[PDB]
Amino acid sequence: DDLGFDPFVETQKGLAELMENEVVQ
Amino acid sequence: HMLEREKIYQWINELSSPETRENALLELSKKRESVPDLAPMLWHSFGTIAALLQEIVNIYPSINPPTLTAHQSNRVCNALALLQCVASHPETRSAFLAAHIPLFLYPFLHTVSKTRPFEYLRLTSLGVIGALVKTDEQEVINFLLTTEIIPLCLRIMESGSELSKTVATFILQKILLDDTGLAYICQTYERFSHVAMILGKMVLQLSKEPSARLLKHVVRCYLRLSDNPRAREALRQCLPDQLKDTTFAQVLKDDTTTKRWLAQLVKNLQE
Ligand SMILES: [Cl-]
Ligand SMILES: [Cl-]
Ligand code: NA
C-alpha cells in the first residue's frame, strides 16, 4: 500500500487501448 | 498440484525457442504473484535469464529515434515483470544484483520520449527498481548509489506521467530513508540541491494540478531530509511557500499520515 498501485498492471491497462487500435487490420 | 508445475516448466522451456517465447512470456507474467517459487525456477538456467535479457536487447534499436510500438512495449514489459519477480525473491535477489541485471534497464530510464509505449516502458522499468528497493537491503542501496540511479529518477520526477513520477519519488524516498542514502545526498550542496530543486518544482505543479499520492511521497522525502542538520538549515531558506501555507490544507484534511509528516517537517524546521 506504500505505492498504492502496481506499475506493471497500470502499464497493461494503459497499453491495452493502444494495442487494440495501433495496427490497421 | 503437478498440473500447474508442468504448465510452468513447459512455458519456461518455451522461452528458449523464439517461436514460442512471446506466448510463454505472457503466460508466465500472469503467474508472477500466484506461484511463490517462480523466481528460483526462472533463475535455475542461464538460458532462461539469457532469453529474458535478449527481449530487452531487442528493443534497444527502438530508442534512436523513438519508434517503439505498444505491442513491442507490452511484450518487453512481460519480460521485465519476470525479472522483477527474480529481483524481489529472498533466494534470488543477491544473485540478480551480483549479475548487475538492473543495468540492462538503465537505457530505458534515459529515454525522454513522451509517447505511451515509452512512458509505460519507463513505468515498468521503474517498477523493477521499486520492487528491489522495497526488499530494504544495504546491498541494493550500495548498488543504486554507485550506478547513478538518483539523476535518472530526478529527470522522471520532473517530466514523467503522474504514475512514473510516483515510482521515481518512491525510489528516491527509500534511498533517503537509508542512513548511507541520506548521507550521500547531503554530502555536497550540489547533490542536495538537485533533489531540493526538483521536489520544489513538483510542489508548484501539485498546487496547480493536485495528486495526493504524489504529494505523500514528496513530503516524506522533505521530512527525511530534515533529519540531516545541514539539509535542515538549507530547507529553512528554500522550502516552498505552498508547504507553509493553507495550499494543500483542503486535500490533507482526508490524508492524516501526510498532514502529520508535514506538521513534523515544520516542527523540525522551527528547531
Ligand atoms: Cl503498493
Ligand atoms: Cl499516469
Ligand atoms: Na557520503
**Residue B29, domain extent:** 1-271
For residue B210, which amino acid is it? P
Ramachandran angles phi, psi of A15, nearest 5°: -90, -20
Is residue A13 within 8 angstroms of chain B, CB to CB?
no
Alpha carbon distance B48, B53 (integer Å): 9
Q: How many CB atoms lie within 10 A of CB B189?
A: 12
Alpha carbon distance B70, B67 (integer Å): 10
Alpha carbon distance B202, B215 (integer Å): 8
Is residue B234 within 8 angstroms of chain A, CB to CB?
no
Cell numbers given for B199:
521536489
Is residue B176 within 8 angstroms of chain A, CB to CB?
no
For residue B139, which amino acid is it? E
Looking at beta carbons, which residues of chain A come within 8 Å of B123? 7, 10-11, 14
- The dihedral built from the CA positions of residue B56, B134, B152 and B94, taken in this order, carries a sign that is negative
Residues 54-113, chain B: which have Cβ within 8 Å of A? 69-71, 73-74, 77, 80-81, 84
Contacts of B217 (CB under 8 A, 6+ apart): B166, B169, B170, B173
Residues in chain B, total: 271
* Strand, coil or helix: B87: helix
Ramachandran angles phi, psi of B255, nearest 5°: -120, 90
Q: Can you tell me which residue has the cell 529481483? A: B87
Contact (CB<8Å) B166/A3: yes
Q: How far is the CA of B120 from the centre of ligand 1 (A)?
A: 17
What total number of domains does chain A contain?
1
Contact (CB<8Å) A7/B213: no
Q: How far is the CA of B92 from the centre of ligand 1 (A)?
A: 21
**Burial group, residue B199, by CB count within 10 angstroms (0-12, 13-18, 19+):** buried
Tell me the C-alpha to C-alpha distance, in Å, between residue B74 and each of B17, B25, B53, B111, B167. Answer: 19, 10, 15, 17, 19
Resolution of the PDB structure in angstroms: 2.2
- The dihedral built from the CA positions of residue B72, B78, B84 and B90, taken in this order, carries a sign that is negative
Q: Which ligand is nearest to the CA of B180?
A: 3
Tell me the C-alpha to C-alpha distance, in Å, between residue B46 and each of A6, B20, B25, B261. Answer: 28, 18, 16, 46
Alpha carbon distance B101, B87 (integer Å): 9
Alpha carbon distance B48, B41 (integer Å): 9
Alpha carbon distance B245, A24 (integer Å): 52
Alpha carbon distance B223, B77 (integer Å): 33
Contact (CB<8Å) A14/B120: yes
Cβ contacts below 8 Å, chain A against chain B, sum to 60
Contact (CB<8Å) A19/B163: no
**Residue A16, domain extent:** 1-25
* Strand, coil or helix: B233: helix
What total number of domains does chain B contain?
1
